[model samples]
Target: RKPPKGMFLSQEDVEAVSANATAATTVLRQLDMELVSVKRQIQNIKQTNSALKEKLDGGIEPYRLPEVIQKCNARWTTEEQLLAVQAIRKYGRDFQAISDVIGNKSVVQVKNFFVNYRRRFNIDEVLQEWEAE
Candidate 1:
């Protein structure tokens, strides 16, 4: 409401209004502080979860590994090695899938076989030649 040109609100009314504003400001400041604290706590928990997951899976994290080389490096005949190599060339060494196409063993068994013996064939050179074809 507009007062006459020479009039103004009483001092007591102005003080009351200023007190209400100050209280509202204090509540907002507290809420802001609480929100920041919650965000930091959430970030801390997520970091912990990420570290735990990474440790559990050979640093592979929450996602499961498709296969490890241990399965592909097992004892093998020349024929099986050739078959495995060919499958790797064709399928890019998706160990479980390659095992399915070339091995008599279960996927886990095949993965262990590869991991135990993958270095036996000097995969880089063999794969390079196979890739050229």
Candidate 2:
């Protein structure tokens, strides 16, 4: 209870209250410190797990592809290359259309195939014509 206007606390009463408050504050600060350390460790673990997953996914992706056709290995068959070029000729650089014609290959794969095919044949004018179409 609050002291009345004219009343005062005894020194022993004040000392007892002060000691309790100090102990409580120390315990609270220790809990806060431990909470912060645990949060940091959790974040570190999450980052480590993310990096490991990215590395594992990257390494296994090549092995997952069929032996006959690996985009990363530059292993396009002659027929595949011809079809991609023909699709580009028919549809221009509309990659979605080209992708549809090319057995639903992703637009990225179709675009990469077109760029590589153009480069290999030194077909600058043909590339420009197809692009402009």
Candidate 3:
């Protein structure tokens, strides 16, 4: 031949290229192991994703209106004040009786309500509603 033209490979050259056969087979086996590992990871994610999708579609929990929670308060609630008003209606200025009527509040808290919240809850009028016999 004058010179090697284009990409030429003889039968001997081809044989030599594949002569390191074990190394090439080891590389191929390593690739196949990694391919199987990737396939396993893909399968696991798909299974989990499908389960999540089903739960999101048909198996989801429903919405519900929340129940009125007790002790939804800052300091004194209107219910407690009105109860105190009714107590004041019956008990007059007896803060102890009013406190016991409310039951949860301390006598000190009732005294505080009587002392401070008189005008706020219109306790002057409520006291007028009360008359000691």
Candidate 4:
């Protein structure tokens, strides 16, 4: 109750705090089983969510390289380039992952597109921070 050593608690303060802690512990014991059941339900939902996300990722069609490049360069739809960069930032500046976001590009194509895209946007300096590691 007095709290631990070096904790700045007076003898009376420790007694009062210890009494409160004991009361709280006694109350928690009455609800222990319910708490266990709720924890189990949380674990089940977490597992289910992971499984569903895996299935969705597996369903994503792999991209084709040339098509990815064509769409990335097209000015009429700048969305493609923008989203690809966002994905790159999310997944890292890795060419393979960036190409996947573009929907149809090879690793090399995506890498080139990203580099050139950066250059055109005057953001070429940003690429220097991303390393293979």
Candidate 5:
């Protein structure tokens, strides 16, 4: 019981303590680095998986497209086109009114259809009748 009481480790004990501390720090650092590497691998795999899924689908999207793309591909039928023309004639450039008559089509789709097909439908004469009056 004649030791230096508290805070009295030998030189060897101090060296061993420091060596353990150093090794533990390096272990934790390596663990963190490995975790970061694994996260990067997961990110890379997700991107690669998404690409493969798209390629396998062959442009037939398994995902829901925005309304605009779906709307473009869903062509207005002849009956709908005729109905739209009648609605336009009745509503006179009020797309909201016209859309309700033509199956609640979105105003954007209604406007798009009118702009794209007016020449083909020869709607100028229809509008001219109202514009002059």
Candidate 6:
């Protein structure tokens, strides 16, 4: 009624934009589903490796720490950490599960990473809101 709050488009133009927005949201939701699938595959691979390690090395999984640590003080890569945070947000606060998706990081490291990340960004309340949703 108010010309869409400073938008100068006509009614039909606004409708067109609304329809496009809906379509774009649909595509993004589909992409999110695919992302979830990718995360699952990551978990599956890790599980397989862990099982293999248990059999071959008496339950000691292969270490991937020192190299990652030297590269970034044991912190996750910026790109990788973004994915990890998204996966964490999507899957809830399961550090072990997130570690699998964010390869080369251990559960402890992932937990600590999220801890610092949350503190830095004040994301605890945001995550809580997401969980509520």
Cα deviation at 51, candidate 6, in Å, is 32
Indicate the residue-level lDDT of 28 in model 4: 61
Candidate 4, TM-score vs. the true structure? 0.34
**What's each prediction's TM-score?**
0.33, 0.37, 0.40, 0.34, 0.42, 0.40
Candidate 4 regions off by >4 Å? 1-77, 122-133
Query: lDDT scores for all predictions?
Result: 0.69, 0.69, 0.76, 0.64, 0.75, 0.71
Model 3 deviation from the true structure expressed as Cα RMSD, one decimal place: 18.8
Clash totals, every prediction: 20, 0, 0, 7, 0, 0
lDDT of 2 by residue, 1-133 (tens): 6678788777765665478658757766788999999999999999999998887766766566453342333356777677777776667768887666655467788766766667675445555777674
Name the regions of candidate 2 deviating beyond 4 angstroms: 1-75, 131-133
Per-residue lDDT of 76-130 in model 5, one digit per residue for the tens? 8888888988887777888887776665477788878877988998888777765
* Model 4 CA RMSD to the hidden true structure, in angstroms: 12.7
lDDT assessment of candidate 6: 0.71
Over 54-130, each residue of candidate 1 has an lDDT whose tens digit, in order, gives 87765556666575444434456778768776676676656677777764646676566556766886666666765
How many clashing residue pairs are found in candidate 3? 0
Candidate 5 — which residues are off by over 4 angstroms? 1-73
Candidates in descending lDDT order: 3, 5, 6, 2, 1, 4
lDDT per residue (tens digit) for residues 1-133 in model 6: 4666877767665565468658757766778999999999999999999988787764445654454332223746788778776766776777667776676777788777767788764567657765985
Q: What are the per-residue Cα lDDT tens digits for candidate 3 across 3-122?
A: 377867677656644878676576668889999999999999999999888877744347555553443223777788889878988998777777767767877888788879888878
Cα error, candidate 1, residue 34 (Å): 52
* Model 3 lDDT, full chain set: 0.76
lDDT for each residue of candidate 4 in 1-133, tens digit (9 for 90 to 100): 5557877867664565468658656656657977998999999999999999888884645753344335433341477667766666566666677766676556776666666777674444444434333
Candidate 6: regions farther than 4 A off: 1-73
